[PDB]
Design a protein around this ligand. Sequence first.
Ligand SMILES: CC[C@H]1CN2CCc3cc(OC)c(OC)cc3[C@@H]2C[C@@H]1C[C@H]1NCCc2cc(O)c(OC)cc21
Ligand SMILES: [NH3+]CCC[NH2+]CCCC[NH2+]CCC[NH3+]
Ligand SMILES: [Mg+2]
Ligand SMILES: [Mg+2]
Ligand SMILES: [Mg+2]
Ligand SMILES: [Mg+2]
Ligand SMILES: [Mg+2]
Ligand SMILES: [Mg+2]
Ligand SMILES: [Mg+2]
Ligand SMILES: [Mg+2]
Ligand SMILES: [Mg+2]
Ligand SMILES: [Mg+2]
Ligand SMILES: [Mg+2]
Ligand SMILES: [Mg+2]
Ligand SMILES: [Mg+2]
Ligand SMILES: [Mg+2]
Ligand SMILES: [Mg+2]
Ligand SMILES: [Mg+2]
Ligand SMILES: [Mg+2]
Ligand SMILES: [Mg+2]
Ligand SMILES: [Mg+2]
Ligand SMILES: [Mg+2]
Ligand SMILES: [Mg+2]
Ligand SMILES: [Mg+2]
Ligand SMILES: [Mg+2]
Ligand SMILES: [Mg+2]
Ligand SMILES: [Mg+2]
Ligand SMILES: [Mg+2]
Ligand SMILES: [Mg+2]
Ligand SMILES: [Mg+2]
Ligand SMILES: [Mg+2]
Lengths: 148, 53, 203, 191, 97, 52
Amino acid sequence: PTRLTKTRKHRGNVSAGKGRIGKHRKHPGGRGKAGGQHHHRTNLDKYHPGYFGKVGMRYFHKQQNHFWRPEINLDKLWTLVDSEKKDEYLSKSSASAAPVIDTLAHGYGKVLGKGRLPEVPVIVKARFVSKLAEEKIRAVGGVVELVA
Amino acid sequence: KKERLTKEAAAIAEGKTAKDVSPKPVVVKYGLNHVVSLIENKKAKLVLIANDV
Amino acid sequence: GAYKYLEELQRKKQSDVMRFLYRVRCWEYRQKNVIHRASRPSRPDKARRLGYKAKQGFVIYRIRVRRGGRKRPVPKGATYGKPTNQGVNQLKYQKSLRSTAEERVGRRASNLRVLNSYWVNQDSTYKYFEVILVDPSHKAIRRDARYNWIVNPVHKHREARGLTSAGKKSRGINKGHLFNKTKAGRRHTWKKHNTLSLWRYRS
Amino acid sequence: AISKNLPLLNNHFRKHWQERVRVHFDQAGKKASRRQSRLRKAAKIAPRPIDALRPVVRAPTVKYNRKVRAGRGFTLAELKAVGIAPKYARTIGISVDHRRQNKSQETFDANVARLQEYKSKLVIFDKKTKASEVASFEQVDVSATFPVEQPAPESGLRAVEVPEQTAYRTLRLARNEKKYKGIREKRAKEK
Amino acid sequence: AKSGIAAGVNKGRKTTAKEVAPKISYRKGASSQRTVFVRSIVKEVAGLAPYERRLIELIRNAGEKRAKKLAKKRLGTHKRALRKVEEMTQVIAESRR
Amino acid sequence: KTWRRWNVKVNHNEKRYATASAIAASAVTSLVLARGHRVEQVKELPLVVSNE
RNA sequence: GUGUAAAGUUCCUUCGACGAGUCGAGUUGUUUGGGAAUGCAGCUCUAAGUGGGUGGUAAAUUCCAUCUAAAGCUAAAUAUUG
RNA sequence: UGACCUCAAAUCAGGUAGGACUACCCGCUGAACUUAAGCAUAUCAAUAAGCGGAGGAAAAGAAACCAACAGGGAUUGCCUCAGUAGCGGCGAGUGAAGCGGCAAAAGCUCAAAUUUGAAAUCUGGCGUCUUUGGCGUCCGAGUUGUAAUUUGAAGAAGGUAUCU
Ligand SMILES: CC[C@H]1CN2CCc3cc(OC)c(OC)cc3[C@@H]2C[C@@H]1C[C@H]1NCCc2cc(O)c(OC)cc21
Ligand SMILES: [NH3+]CCC[NH2+]CCCC[NH2+]CCC[NH3+]
Ligand SMILES: [Mg+2]
Ligand SMILES: [Mg+2]
Ligand SMILES: [Mg+2]
Ligand SMILES: [Mg+2]
Ligand SMILES: [Mg+2]
Ligand SMILES: [Mg+2]
Ligand SMILES: [Mg+2]
Ligand SMILES: [Mg+2]
Ligand SMILES: [Mg+2]
Ligand SMILES: [Mg+2]
Ligand SMILES: [Mg+2]
Ligand SMILES: [Mg+2]
Ligand SMILES: [Mg+2]
Ligand SMILES: [Mg+2]
Ligand SMILES: [Mg+2]
Ligand SMILES: [Mg+2]
Ligand SMILES: [Mg+2]
Ligand SMILES: [Mg+2]
Ligand SMILES: [Mg+2]
Ligand SMILES: [Mg+2]
Ligand SMILES: [Mg+2]
Ligand SMILES: [Mg+2]
Ligand SMILES: [Mg+2]
Ligand SMILES: [Mg+2]
Ligand SMILES: [Mg+2]
Ligand SMILES: [Mg+2]
Ligand SMILES: [Mg+2]
Ligand SMILES: [Mg+2]
Ligand SMILES: [Mg+2]
């Protein structure tokens, strides 16, 4: 709403909050990112270091579908088990019958190894796993089954 | 051709196949595509080619 | 038939026979008017390939179009701008000489629809084209189920709108990534990519 | 022109952008008219469904392998497997795609089952058919009657079987073999 | 057919292969008796191009490397130059009887 | 300009929150009276009538 | 209705024509996000028959994948200061 | 004494084109002010002005496509991809596409084939009728190719079990 703006409060005061000396002007300093190497260097060097220059190699026609690989950690791995059967699986799970967790079918590409698992065997199906994630899954008596 | 077709329609009126009433034609073949295919199929005995094509 | 032989022989353009025929026909076409009516296709096979039929209502014009680039038609070469726009020579027209041939022929025979065209011969000063046109008011065309379509008014001066084979070639109307800018029309694509789309509930 | 600790922006408004501003004031009007077109098209041809039966196909790319969606048309092999000619199929509400082929058996079998299910529910009228029988039918929605269903992810209990080689080691060895396959083959050929 | 894992050579999910009937469009490059015959008659009627005769002279004068460089300069690509030089050597072999 | 913002988005859950609050407020006699409704001769709120 | 017609359907054999100053190449100018060159155009060169095109780093060698150019028509969803 | 080819003439029989409108559409041609705190590449902008051509939509369109998958499957538009890959005195700036969700969905036609036991094709004149046309007849076009048959998804020619 305009009735809440300071334009309504500046009415009657000559300069509208812009100053009598400075005199709000069109474009003092240039337009946009002008002078980034000359008179706005003190700003870009302080707040955006690394702005100028090239780093790394180009990649013509980069298709981001190639690099799709969402991560799921181990402390979040048991959320893919059915909620209505999680407590039963956590109790009655054994080497003879352990829950299967299909991470790809839930939308994940790599299993990472942050956190701690319940000391309960699981069968984890993944496209990729980290070394520690698979070591921790095997330690609770589980296994990682690679899929594609 | 009109007279031949009239005869064949008379024969089909009589109940005949219209192929018996008309003898097999022995005529000159013409048409460039037709004659070229006849030569390629070794069916032409003699070809006369115009000199001003 | 003979059309296969005609096709294979026109591909040997540097053979003695074809060179002789091209010399003689280039002289004759240069001796005629810039635009003239051809009593028949000089390449019946090529005309067949391009939609010509030996019927009443199909017409052939031969036309002669000057070769080379497009000199900028500014007086004394002064462009009055920035140095990037100071070129006068070595500039090129964005349409082909085939398209220019089609458009001038269609302008001359304004009662016909330009169906298509083909190259016939060439020298240093001219390229020679034969343009296949169709009469939309002829009943042999109007009652032909394969050629009624060109009687409809959306095909008025299709050669002037780039809807012939040469025109679509110069417009870049092809499928794939090499034609991203021009697949559905260059200016349409630019307008689409430069339009600010605002919805009622802004996202 | 540049001031404070603020993000650097890319506001592409240096052309005559205000001449190409499309505001969708007609969103509700287009919704309503779109609904009316949809009702008229359905009532014109009732009880024939407005949607042709579409196949089920795997989505391309490594990112959408898992998903399965509606394709464009059933392949000629699939229609051959259910004994329908494509020319006839286009006239009984089945979509045909001459471009798609069946390298693998799974999608082929899924679409053959889908075609056989549609064929069992199909009822083709004729001259002998009366309006009482035609009125005995309701216009179904084919897209909902034969929905595209994602295969269920494997879940439940299964025996744990631990190979001697870890999965991480398997992936590392596969990467190494792919990376050095060419140079190793060249070395073996030279040797 | 696939390795069943997400990395390495022949990566990807295993599927049951189904034999695919080849499309007729894939026969496009194949030659036919009609085109071989017509092209042989057209070669007899037309003859050779000037650069093709020059190629033949270089091949006769043992300039295989020169003939390759000429055929690439004329035709444009190295693959087409290789096929043209092979065709002109077969022409010489068919002209030596 | 026509590309001024005219419609405003509200979270669906918050809109439902407010709907529930208004429905609940319809059963408070003091609120209905301050709202201005001549409800002094209605014996109780909510006022429920038979399906005829 | 002139339905010994027209069309589809299974299998075997023999075949299976498929667009040239065009593709493609060089160079010049312009253009493109297209970067040893995205498209277009001029000029020079100029093909082939499992050939040809594409596979976003130029080249040769070897594979693989995918389409089938240089001819043509076609409603709807889209645009609309008249 | 006559054909054919090419080219003419006629106030010959019958037609057709031009010009107008401007919001959208298909092309050509084409700036500079401006931004870069100067300025020449760049930007404005493949925009304004100029020229040619349409329709109720236009254009595009049934892959010489996208991809690199377990593969998708004509064209168009929306949402997203994405202010991203990339381009850029790598400065100011600029900048798409594939996938994915949806709206709408619709497919096809020639050329290249000997009808060769029969140019089976078509404009026009004349006559007639039930006249957006049918029938008869006569010239003409056309074999330097008009019909039927096939369009790569195929398909053709033979044989084939018969069915719908
Ligand atoms: C001032 C408004 C005019 C001008 N504009 C713009 C351009 C234009 C172009 C058109 O074609 C390109 C067109 O075609 C219809 C109409 C218009 C309209 C016509 C309108 C008058 C017209 N309004 C409707 C009724 C009416 C009755 C009359 O007696 C009568 O007297 C002259 C005129 C009318
Ligand atoms: N878009 C209107 C301006 C035209 N200026 C042409 C752009 C020049 C830049 N070329 C990019 C560099 C080549 N990769
Ligand atoms: Mg202030
Ligand atoms: Mg002041
Ligand atoms: Mg100040
Ligand atoms: Mg300085
Ligand atoms: Mg030459
Ligand atoms: Mg004529
Ligand atoms: Mg010129
Ligand atoms: Mg100027
Ligand atoms: Mg079109
Ligand atoms: Mg092939
Ligand atoms: Mg083709
Ligand atoms: Mg250049
Ligand atoms: Mg230009
Ligand atoms: Mg270039
Ligand atoms: Mg085409
Ligand atoms: Mg209006
Ligand atoms: Mg007259
Ligand atoms: Mg300005
Ligand atoms: Mg300045
Ligand atoms: Mg200034
Ligand atoms: Mg200045
Ligand atoms: Mg303008
Ligand atoms: Mg109109
Ligand atoms: Mg519409
Ligand atoms: Mg159209
Ligand atoms: Mg096709
Ligand atoms: Mg597509
Ligand atoms: Mg730009
Ligand atoms: Mg008549």
